[PDB]
């Protein structure tokens, strides 16, 4: 339950402004994609590149999303 | 002649139901199932209780259809979120959570 918590909190912190398994970073892709005005390591990078090409890519809110997470 | 309706009439009828009724009718028969898997109906259902999002419907529809569709957006995460607050309307953070969950699921199931 701590992994998803850290992933989402850090993602919100970055969006408002380590590479283990590359699991935190896919969630941010929609954050940059659906934005106003528009947007072992090697295999993870390849999957991330495929995901980026798939979707056409080259605080109270943070408290809330965590709250709905648990 | 409701037993032999074509796809267009079934879609027109199903344009005026909610999530429970649509997912319920998806088990009536094979043609009803195929018409119920339509993306437009589930997009309408998902956007019905949002009423505050805005980024352009084209971008949202394209991204959600690329990352799994609007049917996975509903059953996996939207329905559990709406379960303890049926009257509440989903605002901005709920979309940011559900879409991130869809992205993580798609990346996990990619391999």
């Amino acid at each position: 339950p701590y992994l998803k918590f850290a992933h989402f909190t850090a993602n919100q912190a970055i969006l408002e402004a380590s590479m283990n398994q590359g699991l935190q970073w896919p969630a941010l892709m929609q954050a940059l994609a659906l934005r106003e005005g528009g947007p072992h390591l090697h295999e993870v990078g390849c999957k991330l590149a495929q995901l980026a090409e798939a979707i056409h890519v080259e605080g109270s809110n943070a408290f809330k999303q965590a709250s709905m997470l648990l | 002649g409701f037993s032999n309706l074509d796809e267009n009439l079934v879609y027109e009828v199903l344009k005026h139901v909610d999530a429970k009724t649509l997912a319920m009718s998806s088990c009536v028969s094979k043609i009803w199932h195929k018409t119920a898997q339509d993306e437009r109906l589930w997009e309408l259902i998902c956007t019905r209780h949002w009423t505050n999002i805005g980024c352009g419907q084209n971008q949202l529809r394209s991204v959600v259809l690329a990352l799994g569709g609007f049917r996975r957006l509903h059953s996996l995460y939207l329905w559990p979120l709406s379960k303890p607050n049926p009257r509440a309307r989903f605002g901005k953070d709920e979309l940011k959570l559900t879409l991130s969950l869809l992205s993580i699921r798609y990346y996990e199931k990619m391999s």
């Binding site: - | 409701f2 267009n8 027109e12 199903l14 344009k15 139901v17 319920m24 009718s25 998806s26 028969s29």
Partner: protein, 137 residues
């Protein structure tokens, strides 16, 4: 003032503005598909909507719509067919809302029974479609 003939051959007459509510009729009248009874029903609907076009009156019109909606299964099916044929938004929408209210029902046995729908799902497909929509059940 235009004359419309139906399968019965009755040259049912109606005003040009009232007949203009149907896009198909406006664009182009044997009308081999629409039956005389259904054509009369659409004529009544168009007349009432034209009278309304030319709130308390809004809710009176809605009540009249609800009263006219009270028809059996075959009549509703024929009304849907005619509304789709003649490109009428209001009548098709009203019939679709009525059918949606009807299908707002019970477990799938009820829906398959009231409409005489004969499902032929294979056991694997039936069970799989049950599991994939388990959240509703």
């Amino acid at each position: 003032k235009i004359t419309l003939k139906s399968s019965d051959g009755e040259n049912f007459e109606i005003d040009e503005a009232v007949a203009l509510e149907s896009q198909t009729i406006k664009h182009m009248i044997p009308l081999p598909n629409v039956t005389s009874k259904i054509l009369s029903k659409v004529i009544e609907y168009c007349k009432r909507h034209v009278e309304a076009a030319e709130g308390s009156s809004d809710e009176d019109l809605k009540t009249w719509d609800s009263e006219f909606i009270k028809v059996d299964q075959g009549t509703l099916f024929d009304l849907i067919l005619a509304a789709n044929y003649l490109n009428i938004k209001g009548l098709l929408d009203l019939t679709c809302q009525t059918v949606a209210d009807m299908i707002k029902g019970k477990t799938p046995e009820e829906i398959r029974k009231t409409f005489n729908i004969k499902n032929d799902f294979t056991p694997e497909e039936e069970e799989e479609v049950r599991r994939e929509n388990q959240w509703a059940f």
